[PDB]
Subunit: 338 residues, 6 copies
């Protein structure tokens, strides 16, 4: 199994020009793919950014050979109508064949609240996401389609710019129910870092869903997104997590909180202990290696790593040299693409 | 020495458009106008890439200026806050290069979301409110908005260039042209006869001056359609097959389907292109047509060649047209 | 037995003139009238649009003609279905055996005035099907209630209701709705079209009727056609271009909102565009052959719209040279 | 000059009977007709409700009578204001000088069928005022647009429009709306009431007109009254109880939805309740004095509803013994 | 042993007076209270409408009486069903075994204040049925969610919830809802009516219960009646006319919006109209026989509304001459 | 003269316990009660939420305490403003001089159950200001109507209305709304905060009052504080952590929907987070000095919430060691 790893492009924290440069470097350093946040707002003012991912993805596509995906876009009609997400996905895949994966989810109020609409509870947003998947799949047939359901209405519509093979639809979720639905309805799973018991359960539910739908889950992407803090010292790594990613230490439902200023005030309660299992904080690059290998061993076929510190260039070079070449991937592991 | 290239998303695969824009840069074109469509006018045109993704590729692989021509930020395909963010991100990644072209939209694209489609005069009111939303967001502060058409809860563009991109309104309406001068940074209008073009320029100037602005330093842009080919016969045949909508001198903003335009196209004949699509192999004639528009006082011209011979068109213009155009030395460009 | 339908063009003619011409048409051997339910003309040059429902009362009281709306959209823009039902019941009650309720999916030209979401055709068909349900409930003459996707009717009864309801006729060129018409309603009205399309629509209507246990050979199959008669061919063509350029528009027109829009579109229309759509000739034998062909396909009624302003001359010419020579099947069903 | 108005009670009588009786009323000296715009009767025992707009075409074509709706609610339940405007313009165009558009705030009895929120009277007055704005825009005969609190009208024009619009008459018993009527419209219609209320409404209408620069002495002031004539007083009383118990209900009725509701309420009504509301007598001199009193108050037109089913006998009795003796002011303004 | 229900007329009496009279009624042998949930009185002359939910806390804390709403409409006008559920749960938790939640389809008199579409009775029954579903979900004492035609409830739990929920009692005179009550709820409340109607409602309730596997002989069957006791018959009749004319209105009242509307309607009411509706007599034996008859039909509880302002005198007269003589079945189910 | 307010925590305590403890607080020198209007507790561990409006009736009837909602959101989620007005009027009418209506912008914890759009705080302030207008209209005791951005009220009147309405008190920590409170309402309620914020709010309230022509020195300025008293400091801290972790959440909480959400957030809270928010000490001198400081800033009333379950011990400890030693201004305005 040949050398590789995913890089998480944190739109919440970094200017898109910096992200583009760092992705180009990550490619040179042995990373093979990019996960890009679809935000309108950062979690906190101190993070201080939120570029429009869809424009940036065109730049990335045109200046690298990396695979890339949204992690994740909510196509449930607040910022984005599902038909527009479908078109955007189809266009990226058409321009960069084999390279794009459409990552979708149920959304956060932080981003969606700007349009001033009723914000459903999570279970209802899941129902919206399932209907949005239906819309996207209809459009991905490349024919004239119509749709009318509980949440969305689509008049006669066709994607004329449509690749021969649609990009994969990946659902980002930590919910057991949706993980099973993902296996059933979509092409692969993306989930956050969590303890072994939860990760195993989500994998198991995804597999159950796939198999009951007649699909082989061993050939479907199982992707995980993790957060780490590497720096020259442990002390600096911890301080970076506290300053840059206090939301990482918030082990509670965050999808109803509307403002960066709200998270900013909540952040004041966060302490180093709260990052346990959520942000790996250490200068020891062997420990970073072991953490990632463990996740491969659980059966994840791709790992996207978000380094929370502003030392992105140093992180990328350190991983390229001391982490990525030592990871052992299974020989035939499925990657997000077609 | 310079000229604008129109990237026809209705007709051409976005990969082809990217490659042709790169070529246009080498051949002396200095800027790109990109259609924001969901559907082509006809199936025979056969494309519609998502412009916002493509603009990132263009920005990263050329030094061209570029703009949407145009996006409707009036809440069907696109909520105004998202357009503002997209614009700010393009400007931030490609400083000095992006111009946000906006308009009142066409049912062809907007009908997909299944909502009430207002009459043009009402869509103008929606566009004016959208401009207010975009400008609030472009202050780079936390803003709120509640008007007739749009609600925006506490929202801030954190990724915001020091100087916002210009807002350009695409319109052929005298009323909106005046509002454009008053509220926005420059005008984009289609090819039309001299009397209409002069009226729209005059209204734009009136609007600017009444708002305390100097219109001689604001972009006045025009988008035209031509057909160049090896023979006149081939140029005409290309216009008929590729751009019959160019021969439809009637309001098109309510027509919903490519198949509707397709059936309408069957009535279109060469005479219908008069003043709308210049069809000739004579590149001197193309030169004189463009020069006339400069002389009227347009500071930029975006040229859409309707034929599929884009590479040949670009090289023919680069050699025989662009180097001979005479622009005013200090004409304002969109940026 | 001798007969033909006259199309009253509310788009073009003052209602007083239409009333007078229908009275003349009766004298000249026409036996029925189709009346447009419009709010706007297709073009300003056409220049009229009377409220059909008031005019029909005058027609009913001053002639013995059968008459029908061709067609009313009872789908809740200009008209709520319950009001159409009442209007229909009143006409039938005042003029027993003479009225037929022609309904359809509507045009934006007329419906857009109320400023509402205009559904795509397929959805408007679903609306029409629900409207038929409302009208039929009211036609039972009892207290009814209705709640569906599109319409809500609180406790409602037509107290002024004839013993036998007027027939419901659906005007459509859609194969799907033509079948539904056979199934749910009493007869079909369709525009002039080529033989293959007309045969398909007839076949679908029959299939629908038979599957619902009805005999379609006893149900009206009506067609509405457009012609231009004048003293010369040249004048006939000129009349079509000036008066009815929309006749030369072989494309979906249901989304276009303004007379001024059609007016600008009209500038592209040429004589060739009328082929199969508006017969333009002074030769009344040719008019005869065109109409006879349609009878032969199996239409039981034909409504003729002459596009020229020469209505009185048209009517007299048809009365003398066309109507007496048409050969109808002996037992053809007519709209009640 | 000899004249009187006849009230055509759509609630009670088949439209064919009403048409025949109006033709007789013309022969017997009546000069005008007021026609109820209902969907339902007040009670099942009344038992009818023809669609007035169709019937008015028959009336127009078979008599020389003036006629008007008394009244149509153009406030977007049964009827969108733009459709009422078109209907009015068409009747006036077909029957110049003969139609008057009577409008009001509506009754739930008729409007509830469409299943919408029923505003309080004061709000329905605001809706009526906005509807007047829509109707008047359309009556300019140009392309207009409208957007207000209650109504949206996209680009719309009445192409069939008489040179002079029909008058807009507001039917109301409200002092506020009576003043608005003088200000915004062409004349007033009010029900029978005591002298103090009638004087107040007349006074308010005048105030409204004068403040708008108009001369109210040249504007119609119309009243609609209910009587019971029969061969004996006993029969006249019995007819009022059986046919028009709603006449004896001195309380707000605009929220009551069903004929069955009025039917049950009717059981409480007694002869005393008709005082000042329905004159019940066989004495035709008394009918004469009652009507003359109303002229003397300054009403320029009176529409009489006889509540009994003896319409033909009522008409002949009035024609002979009442109408020829009424003394009108010489140059009183009539609705046109 | 000895007992009877007292009706607390919020429409008529200041809540302080009602509290004092309930405390007296307890001393005089009444064992339970029915409290009207109104926002408005039927007439201005009645002149009150306290917020029942606050008053019930005072009653609960100062007596040992059972008590219930008679009735609250939990159908989302004045009150969202979740709030009714919480209010009910809190009263039962504070006063275990004492509260019964009486619910119904509501009256416009109270619900119209919020300015929403008022459905027809049949639809309001559907709303009531869905509200019962909401209340019962909340009464499980767990986190629940709900989405139906009429109501949406996001994750919600009643944390202050007694171990046993209060019974849900439906107030209705409708045969259909009476059956649904037996099926879905815990007991019935119905107004005074003739024997045939009362027997039908009891029969339907039993049928509903048994089909749902329940034993109706152990479920409350409650009736609410209206009487007028005074020193003389003349005074008793006068009190009924002045205080409770709505009692003499044998017609649907659920659409009438204003006290002033009922006030005007009241003018038609006469003593005869109270037959079977308000027993008007000074003869306390007659009161006794009337109540006993209702027990004999199988009602397990009777709530008595004396319409006169002489509440204290009524209570003492009943306590002495009526209550001790009623004979209840030995094991009759009471609302708890 | 000696006094202090007691905060009745519906989030934590069974309403029967709260009633008993308020009766004890009365005996121990407390003079008033603030009652939370919740549907849900902040955490499951708190574990309660009685319907305050029912409980207030029990309180009123069994004590002589002043009492108020702290606070009710009358902005149309759980509660329509008209119903709040009625509830308030009824309490004041039953318990004259004792009730104060505390209102605010609400929390999603309680309001989200009805499944509606939850506006940002600034918009909810606009809703609250419109609700104040509705409540004040109803408090005139006349028939009123209202139509604004957020609320519609059809003809409505509070028939049960005290001569003098209860005061309207706004609970807010916002400088803008504090000024509006001075302008539009009768007094302010605010949470414990640092001196600079409390001074700003007082200053804004005064500015608002004076600009509206009022004297703010005669209007209530109330503060609600949270403490933890126990036998040891260790126990006091432990009680705060277990019972009131939300007290240690110095961030906006108005968008958080579920008890389980707060429950998870609570896990981050530590003793330091209570600084200035919950005074945690067994030292009753320290409690005394804390409360006295607030009097010295110019608050006329203080409501104290002890977060521990040791309410009876807290009440007795305060009654003995705190309340008698507080020094109030001689003529300080109290909520009435
Ligand atoms: O238009 C902006 C830039 O675009 C380039 O491709 C042109 O060829 C340059 O001369 C110009 O500065
Ligand atoms: O078609 C119905 C009737 O219409 C009349 O005008 C015809 O002349 C008659 O022959 C026929 O009875
Ligand atoms: Na274009
Ligand atoms: Na027509
Ligand atoms: Na009438
Ligand atoms: Na609280």
């Amino acid at each position: 199994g040949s050398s590789r790893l995913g890089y998480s492009a944190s739109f919440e924290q970094f200017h898109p020009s910096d992200l583009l440069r760092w992705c180009q470097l990550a490619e040179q350093e042995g990373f093979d793919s990019v996960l890009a946040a679809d935000h309108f707002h950062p979690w906190t003012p101190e993070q201080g950014q939120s570029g429009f991912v869809w424009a940036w993805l065109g730049a990335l596509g045109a200046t690298t050979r990396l695979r890339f995906g949204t992690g994740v876009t909510p196509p449930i009609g607040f910022r984005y109508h599902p038909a527009i997400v479908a078109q955007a996905a189809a266009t990226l895949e058409a321009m960069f064949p084999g390279r794009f994966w459409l990552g979708i989810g149920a959304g956060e109020a932080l981003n969606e609240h700007i349009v001033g609409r009723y914000w459903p509870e999570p279970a209802e947003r899941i129902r919206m996401l399932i209907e949005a998947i239906e819309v996207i799949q209809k459009l991905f047939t490349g024919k004239v389609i119509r749709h009318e359901g509980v949440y969305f209405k689509v008049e006669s519509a066709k994607l004329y710019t449509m690749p021969d093979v649609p990009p994969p639809i990946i659902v980002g979720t930590a919910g057991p129910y949706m993980a099973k639905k993902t296996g059933q309805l979509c092409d692969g799973l993306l989930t956050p870092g969590a303890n072994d018991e939860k990760l195993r359960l989500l994998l198991s539910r995804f597999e159950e869903g796939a198999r009951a739908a007649g699909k082989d889950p061993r050939r479907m992407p199982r992707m995980i997104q993790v957060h780490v803090s590497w720096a020259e010292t442990d002390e600096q790594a911890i301080e970076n997590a506290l300053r840059e990613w206090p939301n990482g230490g918030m082990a509670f439902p965050k999808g109803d909180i509307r403002n960066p200023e709200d998270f900013q005030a909540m952040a004041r309660l966060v302490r180093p202990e709260h990052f346990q299992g959520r942000v790996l904080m250490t200068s020891d690059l062997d420990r970073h290696g072991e953490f990632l290998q463990h996740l491969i061993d659980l059966g994840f076929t791709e790992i996207y790593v978000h380094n929370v510190g502003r030392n992105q260039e140093e992180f990328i070079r350190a991983y390229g040299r001391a982490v990525i070449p030592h990871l052992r991937w299974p020989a035939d592991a499925p990657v997000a693409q077609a």
